[PDB]
Amino acid sequence: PPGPTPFPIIGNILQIDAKDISKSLTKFSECYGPVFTVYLGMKPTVVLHGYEAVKEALVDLGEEFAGRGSVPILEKVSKGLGIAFSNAKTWKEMRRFSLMTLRNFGMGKRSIEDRIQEEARCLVEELRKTNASPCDPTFILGCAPCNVICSVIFHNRFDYKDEEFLKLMESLHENVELLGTPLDYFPGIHKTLLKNADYIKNFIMEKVKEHQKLLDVNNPRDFIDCFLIKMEQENNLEFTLESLVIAVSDLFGAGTETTSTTLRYSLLLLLKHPEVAARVQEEIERVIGRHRSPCMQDRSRMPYTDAVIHEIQRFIDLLPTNLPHAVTRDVRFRNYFIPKGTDIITSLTSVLHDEKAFPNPKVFDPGHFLDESGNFKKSDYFMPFSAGKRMCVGEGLARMELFLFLTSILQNFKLQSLVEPKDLDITAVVNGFVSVPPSYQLCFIPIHH
Numbered sequence: 001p002p003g004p005t006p007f008p009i010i011g012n013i014l015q016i017d018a019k020d021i022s023k024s025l026t027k028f029s030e031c032y033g034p035v036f037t038v039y040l041g042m043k044p045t046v047v048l049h050g051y052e053a054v055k056e057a058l059v060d061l062g063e064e065f066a067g068r069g070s071v072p073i074l075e076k077v078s079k080g081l082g083i084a085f086s087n088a089k090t091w092k093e094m095r096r097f098s099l100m101t102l103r104n105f106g107m108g109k110r111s112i113e114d115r116i117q118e119e120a121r122c123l124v125e126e127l128r129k130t131n132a133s134p135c136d137p138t139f140i141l142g143c144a145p146c147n148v149i150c151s152v153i154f155h156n157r158f159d160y161k162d163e164e165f166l167k168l169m170e171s172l173h174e175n176v177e178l179l180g181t182p183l184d185y186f187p188g189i190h191k192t193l194l195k196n197a198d199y200i201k202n203f204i205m206e207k208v209k210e211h212q213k214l215l216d217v218n219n220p221r222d223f224i225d226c227f228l229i230k231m232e233q234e235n236n237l238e239f240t241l242e243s244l245v246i247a248v249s250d251l252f253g254a255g256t257e258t259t260s261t262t263l264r265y266s267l268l269l270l271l272k273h274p275e276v277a278a279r280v281q282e283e284i285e286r287v288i289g290r291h292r293s294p295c296m297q298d299r300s301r302m303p304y305t306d307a308v309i310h311e312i313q314r315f316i317d318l319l320p321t322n323l324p325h326a327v328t329r330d331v332r333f334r335n336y337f338i339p340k341g342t343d344i345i346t347s348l349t350s351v352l353h354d355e356k357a358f359p360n361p362k363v364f365d366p367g368h369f370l371d372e373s374g375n376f377k378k379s380d381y382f383m384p385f386s387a388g389k390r391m392c393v394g395e396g397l398a399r400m401e402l403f404l405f406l407t408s409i410l411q412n413f414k415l416q417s418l419v420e421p422k423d424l425d426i427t428a429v430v431n432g433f434v435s436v437p438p439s440y441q442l443c444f445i446p447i448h449h
Protein backbone atom coordinates (compact mmCIF):
# COMPACT_ATOMS: atom_id res chain seq x y z
CA PRO A 1 0.00 0.00 0.00
CA PRO A 2 1.29 3.49 -0.96
CA GLY A 3 1.46 6.45 1.37
CA PRO A 4 -1.93 7.81 2.58
CA THR A 5 -3.81 10.48 0.55
CA PRO A 6 -6.30 13.35 0.07
CA PHE A 7 -8.91 10.98 -1.44
CA PRO A 8 -9.03 11.45 -5.26
CA ILE A 9 -12.22 12.04 -7.22
CA ILE A 10 -12.11 10.24 -10.64
CA GLY A 11 -9.85 11.73 -13.25
CA ASN A 12 -8.26 13.98 -10.61
CA ILE A 13 -7.14 15.07 -7.12
CA LEU A 14 -6.35 18.58 -8.43
CA GLN A 15 -9.28 19.05 -6.10
CA ILE A 16 -7.11 20.99 -3.66
CA ASP A 17 -3.90 22.56 -4.98
CA ALA A 18 -3.45 26.26 -5.78
CA LYS A 19 -1.10 28.30 -7.95
CA ASP A 20 1.32 27.46 -5.18
CA ILE A 21 1.18 23.66 -5.13
CA SER A 22 4.01 23.55 -2.59
CA LYS A 23 1.74 25.60 -0.27
CA SER A 24 -0.88 22.87 -0.27
CA LEU A 25 1.48 19.91 -0.48
CA THR A 26 2.38 21.22 2.98
CA LYS A 27 -1.26 21.55 4.00
CA PHE A 28 -1.41 17.84 3.12
CA SER A 29 1.78 16.96 4.96
CA GLU A 30 0.10 18.46 8.03
CA CYS A 31 -2.03 15.32 8.10
CA TYR A 32 -0.88 12.33 6.09
CA GLY A 33 2.63 13.13 7.29
CA PRO A 34 6.12 13.23 5.71
CA VAL A 35 5.05 10.66 3.13
CA PHE A 36 1.66 10.76 1.48
CA THR A 37 0.53 10.31 -2.09
CA VAL A 38 -1.80 12.35 -4.26
CA TYR A 39 -3.35 11.87 -7.68
CA LEU A 40 -2.21 14.32 -10.31
CA GLY A 41 -4.81 12.79 -12.58
CA MET A 42 -5.17 9.00 -12.69
CA LYS A 43 -1.63 8.06 -11.68
CA PRO A 44 -0.31 8.03 -8.12
CA THR A 45 2.54 10.29 -7.10
CA VAL A 46 3.82 10.04 -3.56
CA VAL A 47 5.20 13.21 -1.96
CA LEU A 48 8.27 13.33 0.30
CA HIS A 49 8.03 16.21 2.76
CA GLY A 50 10.02 16.07 5.98
CA TYR A 51 13.74 16.79 5.68
CA GLU A 52 14.35 13.27 6.90
CA ALA A 53 11.89 11.84 4.38
CA VAL A 54 13.69 13.67 1.59
CA LYS A 55 17.33 12.94 2.44
CA GLU A 56 16.43 9.32 3.24
CA ALA A 57 14.77 8.92 -0.16
CA LEU A 58 17.02 11.08 -2.36
CA VAL A 59 20.32 10.25 -0.62
CA ASP A 60 19.92 6.87 1.12
CA LEU A 61 17.84 5.04 -1.50
CA GLY A 62 19.75 6.76 -4.29
CA GLU A 63 19.26 4.49 -7.28
CA GLU A 64 15.80 3.56 -6.06
CA PHE A 65 14.48 7.16 -6.26
CA ALA A 66 16.33 8.37 -9.39
CA GLY A 67 13.66 8.93 -12.09
CA ARG A 68 11.47 11.66 -13.71
CA GLY A 69 8.53 10.59 -15.93
CA SER A 70 7.29 12.87 -18.76
CA VAL A 71 6.60 13.05 -22.52
CA PRO A 72 6.09 16.34 -24.50
CA ILE A 73 9.74 17.51 -24.59
CA LEU A 74 10.43 14.35 -26.64
CA GLU A 75 8.33 15.47 -29.66
CA LYS A 76 10.32 16.67 -32.71
CA VAL A 77 12.88 13.92 -33.57
CA SER A 78 13.71 14.35 -29.89
CA LYS A 79 14.83 10.92 -28.67
CA GLY A 80 14.72 10.36 -24.91
CA LEU A 81 18.45 11.08 -24.64
CA GLY A 82 20.26 13.94 -22.90
CA ILE A 83 20.71 14.86 -19.24
CA ALA A 84 17.45 16.04 -17.65
CA PHE A 85 14.49 13.70 -18.20
CA SER A 86 14.96 10.08 -19.44
CA ASN A 87 16.30 6.53 -19.08
CA ALA A 88 19.57 5.61 -17.37
CA LYS A 89 20.56 4.00 -20.68
CA THR A 90 21.46 7.51 -21.83
CA TRP A 91 21.19 9.21 -18.42
CA LYS A 92 23.96 7.66 -16.32
CA GLU A 93 26.22 8.01 -19.36
CA MET A 94 25.35 11.53 -20.50
CA ARG A 95 25.32 12.56 -16.83
CA ARG A 96 28.72 11.12 -15.96
CA PHE A 97 30.26 12.70 -19.04
CA SER A 98 28.62 15.99 -18.07
CA LEU A 99 29.72 16.01 -14.42
CA MET A 100 33.32 15.44 -15.44
CA THR A 101 33.84 17.68 -18.46
CA LEU A 102 31.91 20.44 -16.68
CA ARG A 103 34.54 20.52 -13.90
CA ASN A 104 36.37 23.85 -13.58
CA PHE A 105 39.37 22.47 -15.50
CA GLY A 106 37.60 19.79 -17.53
CA MET A 107 38.25 21.66 -20.77
CA GLY A 108 41.92 22.58 -21.02
CA LYS A 109 43.76 25.58 -19.64
CA ARG A 110 40.91 28.12 -19.88
CA SER A 111 39.04 27.14 -16.72
CA ILE A 112 35.30 27.67 -16.34
CA GLU A 113 36.21 30.26 -13.67
CA ASP A 114 38.14 32.26 -16.23
CA ARG A 115 35.06 32.03 -18.40
CA ILE A 116 32.74 33.21 -15.61
CA GLN A 117 35.25 36.01 -15.01
CA GLU A 118 35.22 37.19 -18.59
CA GLU A 119 31.45 37.46 -18.77
CA ALA A 120 31.49 39.18 -15.38
CA ARG A 121 33.53 42.00 -16.91
CA CYS A 122 31.15 42.19 -19.86
CA LEU A 123 28.24 42.26 -17.41
CA VAL A 124 29.70 45.12 -15.39
CA GLU A 125 30.50 47.07 -18.57
CA GLU A 126 27.06 46.84 -20.16
CA LEU A 127 25.54 47.55 -16.73
CA ARG A 128 27.58 50.76 -17.01
CA LYS A 129 26.04 51.62 -20.38
CA THR A 130 22.86 51.94 -18.32
CA ASN A 131 24.08 55.48 -17.66
CA ALA A 132 22.69 55.16 -14.13
CA SER A 133 19.08 55.46 -15.30
CA PRO A 134 16.13 53.37 -14.13
CA CYS A 135 16.21 49.92 -15.68
CA ASP A 136 14.81 46.38 -15.75
CA PRO A 137 17.71 43.96 -15.07
CA THR A 138 15.66 41.03 -16.33
CA PHE A 139 17.34 41.23 -19.75
CA ILE A 140 21.08 41.64 -19.22
CA LEU A 141 20.87 39.38 -16.16
CA GLY A 142 19.74 36.56 -18.42
CA CYS A 143 22.43 37.49 -20.97
CA ALA A 144 25.38 36.86 -18.72
CA PRO A 145 24.24 33.31 -17.81
CA CYS A 146 23.33 32.32 -21.37
CA ASN A 147 26.80 33.41 -22.48
CA VAL A 148 28.55 31.48 -19.73
CA ILE A 149 27.03 28.25 -21.01
CA CYS A 150 27.68 29.50 -24.54
CA SER A 151 31.29 29.88 -23.48
CA VAL A 152 31.70 26.42 -21.88
CA ILE A 153 29.99 24.68 -24.82
CA PHE A 154 31.05 26.51 -28.00
CA HIS A 155 33.98 28.54 -26.68
CA ASN A 156 32.40 31.69 -28.03
CA ARG A 157 30.22 34.31 -26.36
CA PHE A 158 27.80 36.71 -27.96
CA ASP A 159 27.04 40.41 -27.89
CA TYR A 160 24.01 41.43 -25.82
CA LYS A 161 22.93 43.17 -29.03
CA ASP A 162 23.70 40.23 -31.37
CA GLU A 163 20.47 39.21 -33.14
CA GLU A 164 21.19 35.48 -33.39
CA PHE A 165 22.00 35.47 -29.68
CA LEU A 166 18.84 37.30 -28.64
CA LYS A 167 17.02 34.76 -30.86
CA LEU A 168 18.64 31.79 -29.08
CA MET A 169 17.35 33.29 -25.83
CA GLU A 170 13.87 34.19 -27.17
CA SER A 171 13.51 30.45 -27.73
CA LEU A 172 14.94 28.91 -24.54
CA HIS A 173 12.70 31.25 -22.54
CA GLU A 174 9.35 30.92 -24.32
CA ASN A 175 9.65 27.15 -24.19
CA VAL A 176 10.42 26.96 -20.48
CA GLU A 177 7.62 29.40 -19.82
CA LEU A 178 5.14 27.47 -21.97
CA LEU A 179 5.96 24.37 -19.91
CA GLY A 180 5.00 25.16 -16.28
CA THR A 181 4.13 23.18 -13.12
CA PRO A 182 4.40 19.43 -12.60
CA LEU A 183 -5.72 15.07 -26.33
CA ASP A 184 -4.94 18.40 -24.65
CA TYR A 185 -3.82 20.44 -27.66
CA PHE A 186 -4.75 24.08 -27.20
CA PRO A 187 -2.65 23.66 -29.34
CA GLY A 188 -0.86 26.75 -30.60
CA ILE A 189 1.15 25.92 -27.52
CA HIS A 190 2.57 22.91 -29.37
CA LYS A 191 3.51 24.36 -32.74
CA THR A 192 5.45 27.17 -31.08
CA LEU A 193 7.56 24.73 -29.05
CA LEU A 194 8.39 22.75 -32.19
CA LYS A 195 9.40 26.08 -33.75
CA ASN A 196 11.57 27.15 -30.83
CA ALA A 197 12.82 23.65 -30.08
CA ASP A 198 13.85 23.60 -33.73
CA TYR A 199 15.69 26.91 -33.64
CA ILE A 200 17.69 25.84 -30.61
CA LYS A 201 18.46 22.39 -32.09
CA ASN A 202 19.82 24.11 -35.18
CA PHE A 203 21.89 26.86 -33.55
CA ILE A 204 23.58 24.09 -31.57
CA MET A 205 24.18 21.73 -34.50
CA GLU A 206 25.55 24.59 -36.57
CA LYS A 207 28.28 24.94 -33.96
CA VAL A 208 28.70 21.18 -33.67
CA LYS A 209 29.50 20.97 -37.36
CA GLU A 210 32.04 23.79 -37.32
CA HIS A 211 33.40 22.31 -34.09
CA GLN A 212 34.13 19.13 -36.03
CA LYS A 213 36.49 20.82 -38.49
CA LEU A 214 38.92 21.57 -35.66
CA LEU A 215 40.07 19.69 -32.53
CA ASP A 216 43.17 18.39 -30.77
CA VAL A 217 45.36 15.73 -29.23
CA ASN A 218 43.26 15.50 -26.11
CA ASN A 219 43.28 19.32 -26.14
CA PRO A 220 39.53 19.91 -26.32
CA ARG A 221 38.48 23.39 -25.25
CA ASP A 222 34.80 22.83 -24.40
CA PHE A 223 31.83 20.45 -24.03
CA ILE A 224 31.34 19.77 -27.74
CA ASP A 225 35.07 19.13 -28.31
CA CYS A 226 35.03 16.70 -25.37
CA PHE A 227 31.95 14.85 -26.61
CA LEU A 228 33.21 14.72 -30.20
CA ILE A 229 36.40 13.03 -29.09
CA LYS A 230 34.26 10.15 -27.89
CA MET A 231 34.54 7.43 -30.50
CA GLU A 232 35.02 4.67 -27.96
CA GLN A 233 33.01 1.43 -27.79
CA GLU A 234 32.97 1.88 -31.60
CA ASN A 235 32.26 4.96 -33.76
CA ASN A 236 29.49 6.43 -31.60
CA LEU A 237 28.28 4.59 -28.44
CA GLU A 238 25.99 6.86 -26.39
CA PHE A 239 27.86 9.73 -27.97
CA THR A 240 25.79 10.48 -31.06
CA LEU A 241 25.38 13.74 -32.92
CA GLU A 242 21.76 13.83 -31.71
CA SER A 243 22.18 12.78 -28.07
CA LEU A 244 24.79 15.55 -27.94
CA VAL A 245 22.37 18.31 -28.95
CA ILE A 246 19.73 17.16 -26.48
CA ALA A 247 22.29 17.58 -23.69
CA VAL A 248 23.46 21.03 -24.84
CA SER A 249 19.77 21.89 -24.84
CA ASP A 250 19.09 20.72 -21.31
CA LEU A 251 22.28 22.44 -20.22
CA PHE A 252 21.23 25.69 -21.90
CA GLY A 253 17.61 25.40 -20.73
CA ALA A 254 18.13 24.39 -17.09
CA GLY A 255 21.41 26.29 -16.95
CA THR A 256 20.26 29.57 -18.37
CA GLU A 257 16.88 30.16 -16.66
CA THR A 258 17.59 29.21 -13.01
CA THR A 259 20.81 31.22 -12.73
CA SER A 260 19.22 34.29 -14.32
CA THR A 261 16.04 34.28 -12.22
CA THR A 262 18.30 34.05 -9.14
CA LEU A 263 20.58 36.97 -10.04
CA ARG A 264 17.46 39.00 -10.81
CA TYR A 265 16.09 37.86 -7.47
CA SER A 266 19.33 38.66 -5.67
CA LEU A 267 19.32 42.35 -6.60
CA LEU A 268 15.71 42.74 -5.48
CA LEU A 269 16.68 41.37 -2.07
CA LEU A 270 19.69 43.69 -1.84
CA LEU A 271 17.40 46.61 -2.75
CA LYS A 272 14.91 45.25 -0.27
CA HIS A 273 17.57 45.09 2.46
CA PRO A 274 20.43 47.49 1.64
CA GLU A 275 22.21 46.80 4.95
CA VAL A 276 23.14 43.43 3.47
CA ALA A 277 24.47 45.04 0.31
CA ALA A 278 26.54 47.51 2.37
CA ARG A 279 28.20 44.83 4.45
CA VAL A 280 28.86 42.70 1.34
CA GLN A 281 30.70 45.72 -0.08
CA GLU A 282 32.59 46.32 3.16
CA GLU A 283 33.68 42.73 2.81
CA ILE A 284 34.45 43.26 -0.90
CA GLU A 285 36.63 46.36 -0.46
CA ARG A 286 38.27 44.72 2.57
CA VAL A 287 39.50 41.47 0.97
CA ILE A 288 39.19 42.10 -2.78
CA GLY A 289 40.66 45.26 -4.22
CA ARG A 290 38.68 48.18 -5.62
CA HIS A 291 40.94 47.38 -8.50
CA ARG A 292 41.25 43.71 -9.57
CA SER A 293 38.08 41.78 -10.33
CA PRO A 294 36.99 38.90 -8.12
CA CYS A 295 38.19 35.33 -8.41
CA MET A 296 36.81 32.24 -6.67
CA GLN A 297 39.78 32.14 -4.31
CA ASP A 298 38.33 35.18 -2.47
CA ARG A 299 35.08 33.44 -1.41
CA SER A 300 36.78 31.45 1.35
CA ARG A 301 37.91 34.70 2.96
CA MET A 302 34.46 36.26 2.67
CA PRO A 303 32.04 34.49 5.06
CA TYR A 304 29.42 37.25 5.13
CA THR A 305 29.17 37.51 1.35
CA ASP A 306 28.93 33.72 1.13
CA ALA A 307 26.40 33.65 3.95
CA VAL A 308 24.31 36.07 1.87
CA ILE A 309 24.44 34.25 -1.46
CA HIS A 310 23.65 31.14 0.58
CA GLU A 311 20.69 32.81 2.32
CA ILE A 312 19.36 34.11 -1.02
CA GLN A 313 19.10 30.61 -2.46
CA ARG A 314 17.54 29.24 0.72
CA PHE A 315 15.06 32.09 0.93
CA ILE A 316 13.95 32.44 -2.69
CA ASP A 317 13.32 28.69 -2.91
CA LEU A 318 13.59 28.70 -6.73
CA LEU A 319 12.21 25.18 -7.15
CA PRO A 320 9.66 24.45 -4.33
CA THR A 321 9.11 21.01 -5.78
CA ASN A 322 12.20 20.31 -7.86
CA LEU A 323 11.97 18.31 -11.05
CA PRO A 324 9.68 15.29 -11.00
CA HIS A 325 11.37 12.04 -9.94
CA ALA A 326 10.21 8.43 -10.48
CA VAL A 327 11.29 5.17 -8.80
CA THR A 328 13.07 2.50 -10.90
CA ARG A 329 11.49 -0.81 -9.83
CA ASP A 330 9.82 -1.57 -6.55
CA VAL A 331 10.86 -0.05 -3.24
CA ARG A 332 9.63 -0.60 0.30
CA PHE A 333 10.17 2.94 1.64
CA ARG A 334 9.48 2.82 5.40
CA ASN A 335 6.38 0.74 6.22
CA TYR A 336 4.90 1.47 2.78
CA PHE A 337 5.91 0.13 -0.68
CA ILE A 338 6.09 2.03 -3.99
CA PRO A 339 5.78 0.27 -7.41
CA LYS A 340 8.07 0.79 -10.42
CA GLY A 341 7.24 3.95 -12.31
CA THR A 342 5.52 5.91 -9.53
CA ASP A 343 6.12 9.63 -9.63
CA ILE A 344 7.93 11.17 -6.69
CA ILE A 345 8.02 14.87 -5.93
CA THR A 346 10.17 16.20 -3.09
CA SER A 347 9.20 19.37 -1.20
CA LEU A 348 12.56 21.22 -1.13
CA THR A 349 10.77 24.28 0.11
CA SER A 350 10.05 22.09 3.10
CA VAL A 351 13.79 21.53 3.70
CA LEU A 352 14.96 25.02 2.68
CA HIS A 353 12.41 26.58 5.02
CA ASP A 354 12.69 24.14 7.93
CA GLU A 355 12.18 26.17 11.11
CA LYS A 356 14.50 24.28 13.43
CA ALA A 357 17.36 24.42 10.92
CA PHE A 358 16.74 28.05 9.99
CA PRO A 359 14.87 29.72 12.91
CA ASN A 360 12.52 32.27 11.31
CA PRO A 361 12.79 30.50 7.91
CA LYS A 362 10.49 33.04 6.37
CA VAL A 363 13.01 35.82 7.19
CA PHE A 364 15.86 36.86 4.90
CA ASP A 365 18.84 36.96 7.22
CA PRO A 366 22.40 36.05 6.30
CA GLY A 367 22.60 35.08 9.95
CA HIS A 368 21.02 31.73 9.11
CA PHE A 369 24.51 31.02 7.73
CA LEU A 370 26.87 32.67 10.23
CA ASP A 371 28.01 31.63 13.72
CA GLU A 372 27.64 33.79 16.85
CA SER A 373 31.44 34.19 16.89
CA GLY A 374 32.51 36.37 14.02
CA ASN A 375 31.08 35.63 10.62
CA PHE A 376 31.81 32.03 9.61
CA LYS A 377 29.72 29.73 7.36
CA LYS A 378 27.63 26.63 8.49
CA SER A 379 24.84 24.64 6.62
CA ASP A 380 22.97 21.34 5.98
CA TYR A 381 19.28 21.79 5.02
CA PHE A 382 20.86 23.66 2.16
CA MET A 383 19.42 21.59 -0.69
CA PRO A 384 18.51 24.12 -3.35
CA PHE A 385 20.49 22.08 -5.90
CA SER A 386 18.54 19.00 -4.72
CA ALA A 387 20.61 16.13 -3.36
CA GLY A 388 20.07 12.85 -5.17
CA LYS A 389 22.04 11.13 -7.89
CA ARG A 390 19.93 13.50 -9.96
CA MET A 391 21.34 16.48 -8.06
CA CYS A 392 22.07 19.54 -10.18
CA VAL A 393 24.88 19.09 -12.69
CA GLY A 394 25.83 22.73 -12.99
CA GLU A 395 25.80 23.24 -9.21
CA GLY A 396 29.51 23.87 -9.34
CA LEU A 397 29.59 26.55 -12.01
CA ALA A 398 26.25 27.93 -10.84
CA ARG A 399 27.74 28.61 -7.41
CA MET A 400 30.55 30.48 -9.14
CA GLU A 401 28.42 32.65 -11.44
CA LEU A 402 26.49 33.73 -8.38
CA PHE A 403 29.50 34.61 -6.30
CA LEU A 404 31.51 36.10 -9.16
CA PHE A 405 28.73 38.04 -10.97
CA LEU A 406 27.00 39.33 -7.83
CA THR A 407 30.22 40.18 -6.08
CA SER A 408 31.56 42.07 -9.09
CA ILE A 409 28.37 44.10 -9.70
CA LEU A 410 28.43 45.19 -6.03
CA GLN A 411 32.16 45.94 -6.28
CA ASN A 412 31.43 48.37 -9.13
CA PHE A 413 27.90 49.56 -8.28
CA LYS A 414 25.66 51.08 -5.63
CA LEU A 415 22.11 49.83 -6.12
CA GLN A 416 19.37 52.44 -5.90
CA SER A 417 15.67 51.67 -6.08
CA LEU A 418 12.95 54.14 -7.07
CA VAL A 419 10.80 53.31 -4.03
CA GLU A 420 11.51 53.14 -0.25
CA PRO A 421 12.53 49.57 0.73
CA LYS A 422 9.53 49.44 3.03
CA ASP A 423 7.45 49.71 -0.15
CA LEU A 424 8.58 47.07 -2.67
CA ASP A 425 7.23 43.56 -3.17
CA ILE A 426 9.62 40.64 -3.02
CA THR A 427 6.87 38.00 -2.89
CA ALA A 428 7.26 35.27 -5.47
CA VAL A 429 4.70 34.06 -8.00
CA VAL A 430 5.36 30.47 -9.06
CA ASN A 431 5.49 29.96 -12.85
CA GLY A 432 5.10 26.18 -12.61
CA PHE A 433 8.27 24.90 -11.01
CA VAL A 434 10.34 28.07 -10.72
CA SER A 435 9.40 30.87 -8.33
CA VAL A 436 9.79 34.12 -10.26
CA PRO A 437 10.25 37.43 -8.44
CA PRO A 438 7.96 40.45 -8.92
CA SER A 439 8.87 43.11 -11.44
CA TYR A 440 11.21 45.90 -10.40
CA GLN A 441 13.28 48.69 -11.92
CA LEU A 442 16.56 50.08 -10.62
CA CYS A 443 19.55 52.28 -11.33
CA PHE A 444 23.10 50.94 -11.25
CA ILE A 445 24.99 53.88 -9.79
CA PRO A 446 28.77 53.74 -10.47
CA ILE A 447 31.21 53.94 -7.57
CA HIS A 448 34.59 55.62 -7.86
CA HIS A 449 36.85 57.63 -5.56
Ligand code: HEM
Pocket residue numbers: 083084085095149250251252254255256258259260262318319322323324384385386387388389390391392393394395397398
Ligand atom coordinates in the same frame (compact mmCIF):
# COMPACT_ATOMS: atom_id res chain seq x y z
C1 HEM B 1 20.88 29.22 -9.67
C2 HEM B 1 21.42 27.98 -10.16
C3 HEM B 1 20.85 26.67 -10.23
C4 HEM B 1 19.94 26.02 -9.39
C5 HEM B 1 19.27 26.49 -8.11
C6 HEM B 1 19.76 24.74 -9.95
C7 HEM B 1 18.96 23.70 -9.42
C8 HEM B 1 18.60 22.45 -9.96
C9 HEM B 1 17.62 21.59 -9.46
C10 HEM B 1 16.85 21.78 -8.14
C11 HEM B 1 17.51 20.55 -10.40
C12 HEM B 1 16.58 19.29 -10.38
C13 HEM B 1 16.35 18.57 -9.06
C14 HEM B 1 16.49 17.03 -9.12
O1 HEM B 1 16.09 16.42 -10.11
O2 HEM B 1 16.98 16.40 -8.19
C15 HEM B 1 18.44 20.84 -11.40
C16 HEM B 1 18.71 20.07 -12.56
C17 HEM B 1 19.75 20.21 -13.49
N1 HEM B 1 20.43 21.34 -13.66
FE1 HEM B 1 20.32 23.03 -12.41
N2 HEM B 1 20.47 24.60 -11.06
C18 HEM B 1 21.13 25.73 -11.25
C19 HEM B 1 22.01 25.92 -12.33
C20 HEM B 1 22.37 25.08 -13.40
C21 HEM B 1 23.25 25.43 -14.42
C22 HEM B 1 24.00 26.78 -14.52
C23 HEM B 1 23.29 24.31 -15.28
C24 HEM B 1 24.03 24.07 -16.48
C25 HEM B 1 25.43 24.31 -16.77
C26 HEM B 1 22.41 23.37 -14.72
C27 HEM B 1 21.91 22.22 -15.38
C28 HEM B 1 21.06 21.24 -14.86
C29 HEM B 1 20.77 20.02 -15.48
C30 HEM B 1 21.29 19.53 -16.83
C31 HEM B 1 19.93 19.34 -14.60
C32 HEM B 1 19.31 17.94 -14.77
C33 HEM B 1 20.10 16.88 -13.95
C34 HEM B 1 19.63 15.41 -14.00
O3 HEM B 1 18.54 15.14 -14.48
O4 HEM B 1 20.36 14.53 -13.56
N3 HEM B 1 21.86 23.86 -13.56
N4 HEM B 1 19.08 21.99 -11.11
Ligand SMILES: [Sm+3]
Pocket residue numbers: 170174
Ligand atom coordinates in the same frame (compact mmCIF):
# COMPACT_ATOMS: atom_id res chain seq x y z
SM1 LIG C 1 8.59 34.01 -29.85
